[PDB]
């Protein structure tokens, strides 16, 4: 899993908003700098900026 290093407020419908410290699963990461992620905290799924998260381990 990955962990959010910052909060992120959605800027389009298909973005995923998240809070610092939230755990995320990267569902797809082949479409560039924005990755499709699923929040293990909220259950929502959407695109995130890949530089706002880090590997958990």
């Amino acid at each position: 899993t990955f962990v959010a290093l910052y909060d992120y407020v959605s800027r389009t419908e298909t973005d995923l908003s998240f809070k610092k410290g939230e755990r995320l699963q990267i569902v797809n990461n082949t479409e560039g700098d924005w990755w499709l992620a699923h929040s293990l905290t909220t259950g929502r799924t959407g695109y995130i900026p890949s530089n706002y998260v880090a590997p958990s381990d």
């Binding site: 560039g32 700098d33 924005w34 900026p49 890949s50 530089n51 706002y52």
Partner: peptide, 7 residues
């Protein structure tokens, strides 16, 4: 926060 990357 870091600059948001291009979409």
């Amino acid at each position: 926060a870091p600059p948001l990357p291009p979409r």
